[PDB]
Design a protein around this ligand. Structure first.
Ligand SMILES: [Zn+2]
Ligand SMILES: [Zn+2]
Lengths: 100, 165, 45, 332, 180, 50, 100
DNA sequence: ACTATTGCGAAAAAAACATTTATTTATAGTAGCCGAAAATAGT
DNA sequence: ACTATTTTCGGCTACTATAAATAAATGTTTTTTTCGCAATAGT
């Protein structure tokens, strides 16, 4: 019963964006309206580390387990996003689709 | 415009709702005549027939409410014996061992003075129960105290034949 | 803010996180992000 | 993880020139070059069958598989905790489903299980009670009936304006949440009346059987809710009219103490009656009992000539007193 | 309001040094109830002191149906006075008590889902199968059911004394939720 | 194969209804549809051809 | 497609919507059965057994004979010929096979 | 078809093990079935 | 405007939910082992 979170923009020296994080948006979903260059994570994603552990029927230690698996823009040329959507599948599972 | 049954527009496909609700009142009606008689096929499914609620597939029913004619078969037997549910069960032929117990608890809260009168009654009552004594004894007239002995004597004799063989 | 808008209902929804995926005023289940306020620099060639 | 010159703990994989080397930012010595890419059985058998049974009704009740996968571990721990032995196999796994149904906070009820199982709600619910308390399930979501308003409308097949029947019903449910009707009542019961009233003002879908075929609760208890909600406060204003923009609280009246009025420094240490003084009332003679004597329990005794009369009909009803002689001679 | 919770029913079992025979205790009694396929023992029903007598085939006995504690004690040896009719031992040693139940009324409505969210880490319930909440207690090791009209019935009290301080202890958590 | 497994019971032969057991077996069609269209390979049985 | 009680056309997800959720663009099959329940035999209608996919611009799909306004409401290009499945996202097509 | 050769095949069984067997304490809740009454419409 | 009856309304009657005992069965339950059949297959 552990989901995945889109927390983003870790801050440093009075400013949110890292050189990777100028185009990552307030929600963690990369902000529509601006370009991307190489590097420059545009979709942050964090996954629980107990991905195969058995569910313990209690509440003891689940507060910090999210290791990151971010999505990084490759390519030798700077591009833009076109637009981004989010939806759900046929089963209740979240869908994310961005197109450059 | 009260909220209890207004008719107020198109209301499509209500006839299947109308045909079933009129038909499920007929379910209990044929069950009523079976109860009073005991006192003495191709079918097409419509989806709204089989619908279930929480009152479904569960033990319990509606006991036939008691009559004044049964009261004199109840209070006098409660005057003769203390409280004996075993023989009053067959006295009320299709009534069961359990709701006659529930009736005893019902009469405790309903009439608390009649049951104490039956408790205080420890004596032969007004001598009208002797016909009711033999009304119980006219069914299958046979000795239960003397003739219903030999059957175990016959059956223990059968064991000795098996031990012989 | 100018938060999330529907596809055809086109309704600005600042829907709080990990709560729902649908829209108001419609049963539609595909969501559109609205464009930022921040300026972007371009050339003219 | 540790450099050989600066002993740094931060390593950064450079993909700028497609070499994918590993290097720290402190001194710049590479860490690694030429990356090497990755181009009981009886206990097993009794879960292999139980895997089939979890998959069965999930296909029937349209359960998405991240519950059925999640529910297997709930079955897995109670398999170890000796919860399975003695109880019926079909009964225990359906209780195990509703745990994950509650934790996932779905629209799925509990009688949808038992109707396919063709048992009572109290049969399948009994082992549900012993599951949660024995296996130490403390946190639990509440059965929020607001989910049922959203889910009932689709199989009801109402008009294409199915948003306004729900947006008004959920604002009715928020108004209903403030009202003191459902406090110990049925979650599907009180949620089966707001839809009846929301579609009332727009359509005539209310036939008192179509909603019973959806909500699976009897017709007389929802009409009771129609009379209960009308006569609490300010409902007479919106019986006939008054568009749904009321913002009030009204009086707080759950119907349980309404019946109770129709019927009509801390506490000290030794202020309540004790129990040892009651033990000291009657002498505790272990063999003797002639200190509580009376005259009617002394007369509580047989009618001496009527023991023939008693045993006559006592053995006139014989079936089980007769076969015990038959069985014992067959035991020899 | 310093009300007292009234205690309605006891159960209490006693051993007997004699094995009980079913034949000579039912065929010459008054409140004769013995159907062996229904139940493997005999029950007496007397309305003074409105208790009931449950015996066992092995010899043991349990009394149930008294209002007070000493009310059970005079009942428990009038029951053996009929056992003094038959040539049996009726050797009772220990008057152990293991359930004394009580019902109460505080008579003001309260919220109970607010405490099922607040004190949900230890006590919980199900709304559809039982209309009240089933509450539990660590300190006296007791269970109890609460309602919405203010009535609380106490069950499972092995000791009579234990619920008196327990009912006082559970009073502030109910007045905590004044349904603001 | 599901039916007779119920019908090999004395008690479960009078009140038993078979329309309940439909939906478990109904999944084999649709998953067999979409997999055979996504993966363009067809496992035939009466002709035994791939 | 449709039932026999409602006898409406259908209510169906749009395929341009269905391709944006990686879903199958399919249509349900309804069967009508009779059997021996018990004491009496019983006939039941409109039994769901599955959802078969339908290719677009068929007479069973909602894109049958539009007027560039319903299809404009369904944001679909009228110059698309159609004739292919939208199973679980991707759009594929049966190729016309042959033998001797 | 008689017999031979064999794996299945149901059925015993065994131990465990929770499950009914009846008691009574209430409280509110449905839930079904029933008149009891009372509106209420045909005539 | 009488005759008839269908709402209209409780009334009844029930009945799991409570521990806390007995307690003779009383369900099964998986695990296991057996013992029989017919099945295959040649004689
Ligand atoms: Zn919308
Ligand atoms: Zn280094």
């Amino acid at each position: 019963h552990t989901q995945d979170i889109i927390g983003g923009m870790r801050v440093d020296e009075n400013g949110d964006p890292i050189w990777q994080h100028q185009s990552l948006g307030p929600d963690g979903l990369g902000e529509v309206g601006m370009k991307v260059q190489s590097g420059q994570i545009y979709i942050n994603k964090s996954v629980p580390t107990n991905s195969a552990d058995a569910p313990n029927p209690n509440n003891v230690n689940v507060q910090t387990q999210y290791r990151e698996a971010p999505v990084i823009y490759r390519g030798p040329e700077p591009s833009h996003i076109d637009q981004v959507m989010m939806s759900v599948s046929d089963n209740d599972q979240a869908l994310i689709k961005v197109l450059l | 415009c009260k909220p209890n049954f207004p008719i107020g527009q198109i209301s499509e496909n209500f006839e299947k709702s109308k045909m079933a609700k009129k038909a499920k009142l007929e379910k209990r009606r044929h069950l009523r005549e079976l109860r009073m008689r005991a006192r003495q096929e191709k079918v097409d499914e419509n989806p709204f027939a089989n619908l279930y609620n929480y009152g479904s597939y569960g033990r319990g029913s509606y006991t036939d409410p008691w009559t004044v004619e049964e009261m004199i078969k109840f209070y006098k037997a409660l005057s003769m014996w203390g409280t004996d549910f075993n023989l009053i069960s067959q006295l009320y032929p299709y009534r069961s061992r359990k709701q006659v117990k529930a009736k005893f608890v019902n009469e405790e809260k309903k009439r608390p003075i009649l049951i104490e009168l039956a408790l205080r009654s420890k004596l032969p009552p007004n001598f009208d129960e002797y016909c009711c004594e033999i009304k119980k004894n006219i069914g299958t007239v046979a000795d239960f105290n003397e003739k219903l002995i030999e059957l175990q004597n016959e059956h223990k004799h059968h064991m000795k034949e098996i031990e012989e063989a | 803010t100018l938060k999330y808008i529907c596809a055809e209902c086109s309704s600005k929804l600042s829907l709080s996180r990990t709560d729902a995926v649908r829209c108001k005023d419609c049963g539609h289940r595909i969501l559109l992000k609205a464009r930022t306020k921040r300026l972007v620099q371009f050339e003219a060639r | 993880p540790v450099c050989k010159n600066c002993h740094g703990t931060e390593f950064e994989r450079d993909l700028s020139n497609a070499n994918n080397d590993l290097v720290c930012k402190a001194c710049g010595v590479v860490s690694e070059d030429n990356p090497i890419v990755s181009e009981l059985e009886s206990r097993e058998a009794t879960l292999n069958n139980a895997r089939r049974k979890l998959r069965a009704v999930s296909y029937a009740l349209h359960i998405p598989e991240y519950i059925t996968d999640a529910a297997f571990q709930w079955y897995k721990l109670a398999l170890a905790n000796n919860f399975v032995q003695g109880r019926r196999s079909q009964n225990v796994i359906a209780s195990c489903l509703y745990v994950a149904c509650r934790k996932e906070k779905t629209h799925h009820m509990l009688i949808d299980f038992s109707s396919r199982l063709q048992v009572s709600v109290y049969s399948i619910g009994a082992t549900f009670l012993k599951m949660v308390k024995k296996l130490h399930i403390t946190e639990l979501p509440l059965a929020d009936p607001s989910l049922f308003i959203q889910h009932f409308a689709e199989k009801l097949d109402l008009a294409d304006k199915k948003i306004k029947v729900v947006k008004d019903a959920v604002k009715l449910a928020q108004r209903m949440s403030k009202d003191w009707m459902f406090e110990g009542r049925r979650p599907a019961g009180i949620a089966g009346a707001c839809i009846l009233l929301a579609c009332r003002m727009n359509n005539l879908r209310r036939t008192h059987t179509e909603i019973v075929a959806v909500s699976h609760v009897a017709e007389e208890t929802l009409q009771q809710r129609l009379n209960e909600f009308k006569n609490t406060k300010a409902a007479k204003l919106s019986v006939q009219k008054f568009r749904e923009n009321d913002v009030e609280d009204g009086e707080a009246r759950p119907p349980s103490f309404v019946k109770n009025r129709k019927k009509e420094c801390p506490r000290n240490l030794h202020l309540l009656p004790t129990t040892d003084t009651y033990l000291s009332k009657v002498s505790d003679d272990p063999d003797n009992l002639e200190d509580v004597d009376d005259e009617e329990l002394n007369a509580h005794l047989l009618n001496e000539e009527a023991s023939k009369l008693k045993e006559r009909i006592w053995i006139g009803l014989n079936a089980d007193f007769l076969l015990e002689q038959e069985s014992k001679r067959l035991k020899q | 309001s310093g009300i007292v919770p009234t205690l309605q029913n006891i159960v209490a079992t006693v051993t007997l040094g004699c094995r009980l025979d079913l034949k000579t205790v039912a065929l010459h009694a008054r409140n004769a109830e013995y159907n062996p396929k229904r139940f493997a023992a005999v029950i007496m029903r007397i309305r003074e002191p409105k208790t009931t007598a449950l015996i066992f085939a092995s010899g043991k006995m349990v009394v149930t149906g008294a209002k007070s504690e000493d009310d059970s004690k005079l009942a428990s040896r009038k029951y053996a006075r009929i056992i003094q009719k038959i040539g049996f031992a009726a050797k009772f040693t220990d008057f152990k008590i293991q359930n004394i139940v009580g019902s109460c009324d505080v008579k003001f409505p309260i919220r109970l889902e607010g405490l099922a969210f607040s004190h949900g880490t230890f006590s919980s319930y199900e709304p559809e199968l039982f209309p009240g909440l089933i509450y539990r207690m660590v300190k006296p090791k007791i269970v109890l059911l609460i309602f919405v009209s203010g009535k609380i019935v106490l069950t499972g009290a092995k000791q009579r004394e234990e619920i008196y301080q327990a009912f006082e202890a559970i009073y502030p958590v109910l007045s905590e939720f004044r349904k603001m | 194969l599901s039916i007779d497994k119920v019908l090999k019971k004395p008690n479960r032969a009078m009140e038993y209804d078979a329309l309940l057991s439909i939906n478990v077996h109904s999944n084999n069609i649709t998953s067999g549809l979409n997999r055979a269209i996504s993966t363009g390979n067809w496992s035939l049985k009466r002709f035994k051809m791939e | 497609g449709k039932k026999s009680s409602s006898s409406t056309k259908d209510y169906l997800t749009p395929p341009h919507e269905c391709r944006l959720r990686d879903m199958t663009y399919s249509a349900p099959i309804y069967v009508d059965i009779e059997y021996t329940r018990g004491r009496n035999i019983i006939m039941h209608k409109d039994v769901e057994i599955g959802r078969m996919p339908i290719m677009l611009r068929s007479n069973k799909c909602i894109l049958y004979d539009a007027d560039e306004s319903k299809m404009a409401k369904l944001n679909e290009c009228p110059l698309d010929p159609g004739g292919y499945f939208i199973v679980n996202g991707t759009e594929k097509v049966i190729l016309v096979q042959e033998q001797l």
